[PDB]
Amino acid sequence: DTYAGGQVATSSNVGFLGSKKFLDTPFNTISYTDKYIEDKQAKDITEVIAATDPSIYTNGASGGWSENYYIRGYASSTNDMSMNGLFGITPFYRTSPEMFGRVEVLKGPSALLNGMPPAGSVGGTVNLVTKYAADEPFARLTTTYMSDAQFGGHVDVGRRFGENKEFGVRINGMYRDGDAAVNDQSKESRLFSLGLDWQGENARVFVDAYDALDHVDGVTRGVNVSTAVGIPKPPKADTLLSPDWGSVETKDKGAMIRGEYDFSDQLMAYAAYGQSTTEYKYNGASAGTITSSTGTLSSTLGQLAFDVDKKSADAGFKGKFETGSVKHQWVANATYYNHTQDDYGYRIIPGFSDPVITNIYDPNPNWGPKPEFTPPFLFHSTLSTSSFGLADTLSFAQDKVQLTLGLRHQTVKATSSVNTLPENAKSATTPGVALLIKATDKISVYANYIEGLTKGDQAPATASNPGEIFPPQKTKQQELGLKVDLGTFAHTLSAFEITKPSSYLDPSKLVNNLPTFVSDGEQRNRGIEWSFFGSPIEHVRLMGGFTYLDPELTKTKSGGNDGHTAVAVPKNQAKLGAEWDTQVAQGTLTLSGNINAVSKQYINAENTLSVPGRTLLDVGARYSTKVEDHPVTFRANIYNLTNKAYWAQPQLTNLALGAPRTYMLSVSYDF
Amino acid sequence: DTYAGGQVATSSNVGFLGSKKFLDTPFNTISYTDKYIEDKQAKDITEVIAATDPSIYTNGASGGWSENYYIRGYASSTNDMSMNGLFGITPFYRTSPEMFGRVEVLKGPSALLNGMPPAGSVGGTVNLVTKYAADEPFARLTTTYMSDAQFGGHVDVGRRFGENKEFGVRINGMYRDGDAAVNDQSKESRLFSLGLDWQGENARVFVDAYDALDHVDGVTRGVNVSTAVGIPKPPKADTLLSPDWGSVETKDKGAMIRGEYDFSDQLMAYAAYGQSTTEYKYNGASAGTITSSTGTLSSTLGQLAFDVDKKSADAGFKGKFETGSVKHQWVANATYYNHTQDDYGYRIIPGFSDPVITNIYDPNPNWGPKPEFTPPFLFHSTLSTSSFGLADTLSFAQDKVQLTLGLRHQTVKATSSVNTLPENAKSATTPGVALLIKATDKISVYANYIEGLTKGDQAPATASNPGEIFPPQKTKQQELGLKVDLGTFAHTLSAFEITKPSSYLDPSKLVNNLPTFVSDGEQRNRGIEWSFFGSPIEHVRLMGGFTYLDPELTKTKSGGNDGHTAVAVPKNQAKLGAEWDTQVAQGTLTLSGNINAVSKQYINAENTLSVPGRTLLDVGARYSTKVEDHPVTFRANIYNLTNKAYWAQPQLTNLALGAPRTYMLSVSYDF
Amino acid sequence: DTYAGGQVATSSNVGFLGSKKFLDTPFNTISYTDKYIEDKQAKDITEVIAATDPSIYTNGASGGWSENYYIRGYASSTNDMSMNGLFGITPFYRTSPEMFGRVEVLKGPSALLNGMPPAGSVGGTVNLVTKYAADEPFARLTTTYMSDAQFGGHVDVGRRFGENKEFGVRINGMYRDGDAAVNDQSKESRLFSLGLDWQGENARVFVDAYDALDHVDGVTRGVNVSTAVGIPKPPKADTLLSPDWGSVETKDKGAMIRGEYDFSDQLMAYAAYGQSTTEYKYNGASAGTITSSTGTLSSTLGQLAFDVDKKSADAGFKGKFETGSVKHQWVANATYYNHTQDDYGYRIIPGFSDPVITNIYDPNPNWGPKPEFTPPFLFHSTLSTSSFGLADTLSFAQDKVQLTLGLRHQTVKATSSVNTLPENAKSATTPGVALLIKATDKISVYANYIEGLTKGDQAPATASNPGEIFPPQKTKQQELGLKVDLGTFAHTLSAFEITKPSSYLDPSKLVNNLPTFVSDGEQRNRGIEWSFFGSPIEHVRLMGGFTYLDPELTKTKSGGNDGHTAVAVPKNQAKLGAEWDTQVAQGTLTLSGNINAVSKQYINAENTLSVPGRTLLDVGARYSTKVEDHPVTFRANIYNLTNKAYWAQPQLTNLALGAPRTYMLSVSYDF
Ligand SMILES: [Fe+3]
Ligand SMILES: [Fe+3]
Ligand SMILES: [Fe+3]
Known part of the structure; x- marks a missing residue:
């Protein structure tokens, strides 16, 4: 299954179409192996x-309240990752990758294949494939360090x-x-999976369960800027611009079961059921605001907790038949997702309602005392989705x-216990069509x-169409795309156009003398x-590429920002990861390097604030050998080797500092 | 004599009991070789x-006025190091290790074995064993660099x-x-030894003499904090928080002679005599005080000079005999130490009694003008100690x-020329007992x-018992301890309890309505x-361990701090040094790494101020080859490779910054 | 022609004496190869x-308005570099080295050999030898990175x-x-050559042409200090202490033609003609002035543009003959140089005459608005030189x-359109004599x-001798010197004394009771x-050395500064570059290090301000291999590895920061 280099797989799950090979998939897809994950010493999915x-672009901050x-x-x-094809199972905000044999990416939207995931994001689908027991008995202990003083271990x-050998058990534990x-940021993670x-002969069952914790002390929340004041030069990269006493914690528990039954070699049924719980808690800043070019920062404090119970299911049939010299491979499925949720929080913490005044350049900021965590109940809420789907591939x-x-x-x-407005189900029907031509056995268009x-x-309630819920x-x-497998090295070239609508209150469209809410x-x-990926010559692995992106706001409220560039994302990216192997005594030495170059990003939709591009370097070494015939691997990595200080745009706030130089062993x- | 790996020796000097092997020593001992010293590029004893x-714990500051x-x-x-078993000879405050073939540590107090060294410290005995001429003629030149711009050489x-070959001459020169x-710190060191x-056939004589200089410009004195103001975040690790014009200099000269005479193979006499002089001069801060959380620093200035002339002697008899099936190995000795000393100083420098005001985060502190060094005479003082010891080991x-x-x-x-209070000799008798059982010839308990x-x-004079001198x-x-020699790798496991008394004026114990001075x-x-130490597998060396320490203040003035943890020291330490050898062309390449991880330390006895644990990494490479058949060794080391900034507790002041990233070639x- | 190691050549151009071997040259000479240039990733001549x-000493600043x-x-x-022996062709202020096969240095003045170059400097002659087509067809692409985000490529x-194969074409393109x-400094370079x-059989023609651009945004201009205020500690090394909006640009275009004609093996004629144009533009600070020890900076703004058109020629004969057992090798030449120039500028920019006030330690300075570039015409100026020369070497x-x-x-x-004073040609005659003795075929004195x-x-006009033009x-x-070629490793040892006159109006020397203009x-x-250079042992290259310099102001106006040390230059330098090769797989791995140590330098001629010595480290790695028999080379370099912050003296202003840590791939x- 694994491609030359051991780091990428040759197939991935293409939603309910199931497992498809690289050259047979009319989508831009990549699948990373557990080998790659361990080689990066990846601590979350982003790092994979x-x-x-x-x-793919991240703002690259360390110890945020979620991945981004x-x-x-x-x-x-x-929220929208799948586990073995099923949504609503994975950790809510951050996932440590120890329990996965593959991390698969399908680029662009995929409603036909996957339906609507719980947060309704459309960028792409990340599918996490869990580990199962190989034939040979197996036990690996790994000890980890990360600067400055983070220690852990992982048993598999x-x-x-x-x-x-028709039953399998695979256990992972990590702390x-x-x-x-x-500075003043600590990270705790736990996983049991x-x-x-x-x-069986005609039947298969897979069960997966996990219990996870993610905890950050000195969580990074980021800071807001204005056009009046502007964006000052970034402090050094290891600065924390949020309260030192601030913290976030997420506990995630999940379990799922898949069954398959072969009626014949022309018909199979499958069913998947799962559930998960999330407990989120945050105590810290809601926002810092930079109020002067001398670096003055005004921070408001907030608290939030929410608890969510999730259930999800996906069941269907796959089959084959022939019509003359045309082979048909079809699938039909039904999916269900439900969650219930309670939210607790303060927008204003009693006794702590005055903003905390600091300066972004102060090495010893006074963040004041840590308020007791007592957020009051705000509201109960629910979300239900269901879908029915059908596809045929004609060959x-x-x-x-x-x-x-x-x-x-x-x-x-969706429902909410503080919504007086009407609550009703809504529905849509979404098609898809894909065409693939194997020009040769190495080239697909x-x-x-x-x-x-x-x-x-x-x-x-302020609109001409108050309480209307859009579908x-x-x-x-x-x-349009081109794929080339040269044997040990592979290329993808693809071009795309994706339009995403948004909704807003439009003052120019008057109905009963009122502004109308529109999806325009x-x-x-x-x-x-x-x-590209794989091994272009022996003892060398090479993975990366180049993208040009034109993200244009084509239609905006009142036309103010028509033709502007979207916030946060760069127009140009170039990435290259390279590894080189050489024999040294009774082992293999690998040297690795990564470069990551991006262009500037706008901070507001008016395009009057921006931050420059940055180029980040990483290096690693790896030594694999045997001690008394037991495999042993040593790994060292430095990320952001030059300790470049940069602003980029996180969720909810305008700016946050990128992660500093980080050592991992x-x-x-x-x- | 040297153990597998070449870095540790298999025997050490156990005070007047003499040379004993690892498995024969009922104390926790370690002896480091000159090979280890050279491999670390150690510049002082602490680094060894x-x-x-x-x-062993150090606060790890660079360019202090002494080791700590x-x-x-x-x-x-x-003050309490011995040279070839004799006290009062070694440099007063810092010792460069070029002239020593071994550096030996005996852990815990050792009054029975060693008597009372001049400063009366009880943690352990460090014994420095000088170099003598090996049989084959020998000449080694070494050139040294340390960042930023320190250059030197050593001839041996x-x-x-x-x-x-009954006479030997061994000369060491270093600059x-x-x-x-x-920043703004320079280090000068000089040694001639x-x-x-x-x-002889039945007699042996050893003579050692040395002349040493230690000089630091921009000496680090450290800084004081209060509970009101607190401990601010450490500046970057290469910051100097003492005057840039401040300096310390110590000149140390010493010589000693040992003689042995064998009357028979059952009776030997020995005598050792030595003397040394110390000239100490310091011009700089007495203390920085952090007076605000913004990092304001108020530094008072002081000057000190002292000259001390020391003489030291140890003479006795060792013998063996048998009574039934019990072997006796006994020793009886007498020791003498005397010093005379003059002290000159200012607590308040005329024209410089106002503290210099800076901020610890300033890149451009104004330390003011350098006061002329003119400390006036304060007092003459003396210290005399003598002992008589007997011990027998029954086998x-x-x-x-x-x-x-x-x-x-x-x-x-002790006497002082400004003490009006009585001066009298005092005495005590100190016993010891040790038991060792060789369970096997590999295992000792x-x-x-x-x-x-x-x-x-x-x-x-203010006490109920005024002028009373305690014994x-x-x-x-x-x-209790366990030692295991597996052959090329060795373990020690030991547990200990050590109580140390202190004396204070006690307001709660009134006699004639006056506070009583007590030793409670x-x-x-x-x-x-x-x-553990040695080589656990071929081409690997490993040395390090783990300790848990509970240092408790069990009885304190007025009971205020009863049950508190002692200042300065961590409760938990883990240290690991590792070396890996591989053949590379015509030579051996060694790669080395060190980790040093400690938990938090309290800064005051009230335990209301503390500093966190920290982890430091070091890496090295070493290449040993030959050039025209002449041995050549190249050594490169980086210490504190992450350039971690941390506070720890020095002598006399509350805090000082640990040494920054340091390169050594x-x-x-x-x- | 290249020495062991590939990095230095065995011959260089000794002015009009032509090509001479190392052991035949009675001057201190070195020639670096294009291999060395590529290995250093040199971006200008200084870096070679x-x-x-x-x-050689540079102040080492990044992104100045010229090399120094x-x-x-x-x-x-x-201004005074030659190209294939001809002056007035090379770029005016900075030269990227991509078009050169050799960079040659002759140390000390060389008027006999070279005449008077356009700026009349006397330190030494740098001669840049252009690339011509080798026999075997050749095409090399190189991609470059330099921190933070400078990307480029070079085609040869x-x-x-x-x-x-009697015609050759060799093309270089670089961007x-x-x-x-x-921080906030960008660098653009372009070259087409x-x-x-x-x-031919009796005759040879060489033509060279190039078009070059050098552009810096955030150009470093440096800052002035006074004795009243003093020199504060340097900000961190990557600080820009000139306006962020400030820029310099130089466009240089040049072309030359050389012809040679062999009349016989004893007589040759040659002629060279060339021309070049320079367009310089600068918009930014004329100077920053440090006006307080807290780091207050007062910056005045200025603008300059100048255009210069240059022509130059060199023609002559070389011959040999023998009379008795004395060989004669003679040369005779005539040289011509002319430039015309227009200067435009503001000393004071209208509407921007108020200084911009910042602080050198401010992370977020406000440099204010960039003035429109509108410098008015100031003056037209010309320079003409000619020479004729004869020399004979008797052997x-x-x-x-x-x-x-x-x-x-x-x-x-020289002429100037704003000089009312007389303008007249002046002349001088300059001799030279050299003696070389080969004690062996390895040793020359x-x-x-x-x-x-x-x-x-x-x-x-204020002098006794107003309008007098000195010759x-x-x-x-x-x-006096010694050269030793041991075979693969070479040494030069030389001692020199150079006196350089200056001229000033001297009030102490009266004629008709008026101060006299003198060359005293x-x-x-x-x-x-x-x-030394080359390979002292197999698989090792070593290049560097040590100098002591006594640069004394022996005679100054009024005698005030008599006996002082000259500004800017260190008295002591030690430099060492070392490379070590190891065979690994199918290629060579090279590791490299450089150390550069210098002593203190005076900032003023009164010698009341100085900046300390500094030591800088660099490290490198190189891997050379073949891929399908195509040579491939990977290079990584870090310069100023410790990121030392230091002041040194540039042109026209007192101080500028040295370049920070810089990564290059x-x-x-x-x-
Ligand atoms: Fe929120
Ligand atoms: Fe003191
Ligand atoms: Fe100028």
Whole structure:
């Protein structure tokens, strides 16, 4: 399954179409292996998928309250990841990757394939494939360090049972804790995970469960700027611009089961059910605001807790048939998601309502006392979605021309206990079509049209159309692409256009002498991507590429920002990761380097504030050997080697500092 | 004599008990070789004994007015090192290790073995073993660099003379000078040493003499904090928080002679005599005080000069005999120490009594003009100590059970030319017992009781018992331990409890309605130590360990701080040094790493101020080859490679910054 | 022609004496190859000639308005470089080295050999040798990075044509652009160069042409200090202490043609003609002035543009003959140089005459608005020089004793459109003599006397001798030296004394009771140099040395500064570059290090202000291999590894910051 280099896989899950090979997939897809994950010493999903992929962008801050990445220049919510194809299971805001055998990315929207994930983001789909027991018994201990003083370990054990090894058990345990690379920031993570499987003759069952904790002391929340004051030069990269006593914690627990049954080699049924819980707590700043070019910062304090219970299901049939010399491979499915949620919080903390005044350049800021965590209950809320989908792939001319057609019907309903406005389900129907031509056994050309869905907004009580709930809103993609597998090295070249609508109150459209709430907003992302992976010569691995992105606000409230560039995302990215192997005594030495170059990003939609591009370097070394015939691997990594200080745009606030120089060490031992 | 790896020796000097092997020593001991010293590029004793020993702690500042280390959580004064078993010879405050073939540490107090050293510290004994000429003629030149701009060299030459090579001459010369790694700090060091020996048939003589200079411009004195104001975040690690014009200089000259005479193979006499002089001069801050959380620093200035003339002697008899199936190995000795001293100084410098006001975060502090060095005479003082000791080691069962019993009488008298209060000698008797059992010839189990002595304090004129001089005060240790030599790798596991008394004026104990001066104070250090050294597999060296220490103030003035943790020392330490060798062309390449991790330390005895734990990394590379058949070694080291900024507690002031990232290069050539 | 190591050449151009080997040259000479240039990733000439040569000093600032270096402690103007032996062709202020096969240095003045270059500097002659097409067709692409975000590429292609490959074409293209290592400083460079040659039977023609751009945004201009205020501690090294909006741009275009004609093997004629244009523009600060010890900076603004059109020619004969057993090798030449120039500028910009007030330690300075570039015409000026020269080298004993004698007559005239005072040509005659003795074929001993010329000054209207124009002023050198070629490693040891006159109006020397304009000023530089290059052991390269310099102001106006040390230059330099090669897989791994240590430098001629010595470290790695038999080289370099912040003296202002830590990457591929 793994490609030359061991770092990328040759197939991925293309939503409900299932497992498809690189050259057979009319979408831009990549799948990273657990080997790559361990080689990066990746602590979250971002560190896996953003490192070498020029169609993915992160603001790159350390110890935020969530991960933050864009795919094809649109937000891709952490809420919207799948586990073994199923949504609503993964951790809410940050996921440590120890329990996954693959991390797969499908770029662009995919409503036909996947339906509408819970946060309705459209950038792309990240699918996390869990670990199951290999045939050979297995036990690996890894110890980890990260600067300044974060220590941890990870145990991974697998064994199969029964006379034909038809049962599997795979267990992962991980703990790490201590000060991180940012001043007064510490990071705690815990994971316990279970992967069980039964391989029957005509039937298969897979069970996965996990218990996870993510905790940051000195969480980074970021800061707001104005045009009046402007953006001052970034403090040094290890500065924390949020309260030192501020903290965030997320506890995530999840479990799922998949069953498959082969009726024949022309018909299979499958079902997947799962559930998860999230507990989020945050005590710290809601925002810092830079109020002077001398670096004065005004911070308001807030608290939030929320608890969410999630359930989800996906069941269907796959089959094959032939019509003359045309082979048909079809799938039909139904999906369900439900959550209930309680939110507690303060916008204004009693006794702590005055803003805390500091300066961004002060080495010893006074953040004041830490308020007790007592957020009062705010509201109960729910979300339900369901979908029914159908697709067929027609293969002509000895499978050299493959046409996929499908449609999905999607329903969604949200409720809130402080909403007096009407609450009603709404529905939309989303098609997709993809065409793939194998010009040779090494070269595929492909095109697709496909959509993404986002829950419709509700017009406020101040509108001509008060309380109107829009149907799910259609993001629309067209894509043309070329894929080349040279044998050990592979190239993708793809161009895309994706339009995403938005909704707003429009004063220019008067109905009963009132402003009308409309879905007339639009952002249009046009992009070219060239990317590559594998081994272009022996003992060398190379992964990366180049993208040009034009993210344009084509239609905005009152036309003010028509033709402007979208905030946050760069127009140009270039990324290269390279590894070089050489034999040294009784082992392999690998040297690694990464470069990550991006252009400037706008901070507001008026395009009157921006931050420059930056180029970041990383280096690593890896030594793999044996001690008394036990495999041993040593790994050292430095990220942001030049300790470049830069602003970039996080969620909810305008700016945050990128992560500083960070050292990571790990040693692993196979029992 | 040297253990596998070349870096540690298999025997050490156990006070007047003489040379004993690792498995035969009922104390926790380690001896480092000159090879280790050269490999660390150690510039002082601290860099030798603290690097991998988790029972030793230093605050780790660069360019202090002295070394500073604790052993088993108690101060071990630089004044209290021995040279070839004799006290009062070594440099007063800092010692560059070029002239030593071994640096030996015995952990815990050792009054029975060693008597009371001049400063009466009880943490451990550091014994410096000088170089003598090996049989083969020898000449090595080494050139040294340390960042930023310190250049130096060291010559080591030895030759033996006479027809049976019964005379030896060994000469060491060293100079280095230039800017160090701390801003505005420069370090000058000079050493000339002589080791002469004569090996007769029934007699031996050893002579050692040295002339040393230590000079620091921009000496670090450290800074004081209060509970009202608190401890601000450390400036960057290369900041100097003392006057840039401040300096310290110590000139040390010493010489000693040892003679041995064998009457038979059952009786030997020995005598050792030596003397030394110290000239200390300091012009700079007495203390910085942090007077605001913005980092305002108020620095008072002081000057000190003192001259001290020292004489030292140790003479006795050792013998063996048998009574039944019990072997006896006994010693009886007498020791003498005397110094005379003049002190000159200002507590208040005329024209410079106003503190200099700076801010600890200022890149451009104004330290004002440098006052002329004109300290006036303050007082003449003397210290005399003498002891008489007896010990016997009884061996049973083919030397598999060894019981040591001993006691020592200790006398001490101090005088001062400005003391109106009585001056009298005082005395104490200190016993010791140790038991060692060789379970196998690889495994020893041991236990000891032994004491340390400290000069008694004198009650002030304001007391109910005015002018009373206490006898030498007894620190008391109990220890249980286990040692294991696997062949090329060795373990020690030991547990200990050490109580140290203190004296104070007690307002709560009234006699004739006046406060009484009492010796009722107590600190109790309980510890577990696991440490190891050698080569656990081929081409690997590993040295380090783990300690837990509970240093508790069990009895304090008025009971205020009863149950508190002692200042300055961490409760937890983990240290690991590792080296890996590989063949590379015509030579051996060694890669090295060190980690040093400690937990938090309290800054006051009220335990209301503390500083966090910190982890420091070091890396090295070493290449040993030949050029035209002449051995050549290249050494490169980076210490504190993450350039971690941290506060820790020095002598006399509350806080000082740890040393920054420091680069060291050396090349050595054998003629 | 290249020495062991590939980095230095064995011959260089000794002015009109032509190509001479190392052991045949009675001057201190070195020639660096394009291989060395590529290995250093050199971006200007300074980075080639200053890195390892202890007789060369630069202040080392990043992004100045010109290069700045001294040779033997005297300014060597960038104006005064030669291209293939001809002056007035090279870029005016900064030269990127991509078009050169050699960079050659002759130390000390050389008027006999070279005449008077346009700026009349006397430190040394830098000669840049252009690239011509090798026999085998050639194409190399190189991509470059420099921190923070400067990217570039260089193409080098050559082919020969005709049946005997008697025509050659060699083309170089280079572009780089982006943010450099200094905050808010960007650097753009462009080069297109052409080297054409025809090799006939009796005759040869070489044509060279280039078009170059140098552009800096955030140009560093430096800052002035006073004795009243003093010199504060340097800000961090990547600080820009000139306006962020300030910029300099130079466009340089040049072309030259050389013809040679062999009349016989004993007589050759040659002629060279060339021209170049320079357009310089500068908009920014004229000076910052540090007006308080807290770091207050007062910056005045100015603008300058100048256009200069240059023409130059050199024609002559070389011949040999023998009379008895004495060989004669003679040369005779005539040289011409002319430039016309227009200057536009503001000393005071209308509407921007108020100084901009900042602080050198401010992370976020306000530099105010950028004034429109509108400098008005100031004056037209011209410079003409001509010379004729004759020299003979008399040799015997197979050239093992060589005596060189010569004379050159030099004429110069300057005009200016704002000079009312007389304008007249003036002349001087300058001799030279050198002696070389080959003690062996490995050892040469040599001595020389030779002069440098500088245009005479004109007495002001306030003098006794108003309007008098002095003749060309004679700098005078005497030198004694020793060269040793051991085979693969070479040494030079030389001692020199150079006196350089200056002129001033002297109130102490009255004629008709008026001050007299005199040439009574003198600076005298005495030096010892030990330097070396090549491979002392297999797989090692070593290049560097040590110099002591005594640069004394021996005679100054009024005698105030008599006996003081000259500004800007250190008295002591030590430089060492080392490379170590290891075979690994199918390629060579090279590791490199550089150290550069200098002593303190005076900032004023009163010698009441100075800045300390500093030591800088650099490290590098290089991997050279083949991919499908195509040569590939990877290079990584860090310069100023410790990121030392230091002041040094640039042109026109008192101080500027040295360049910060700078990372450089390049990859080259041969088609
Ligand atoms: Fe919120
Ligand atoms: Fe004192
Ligand atoms: Fe000027």
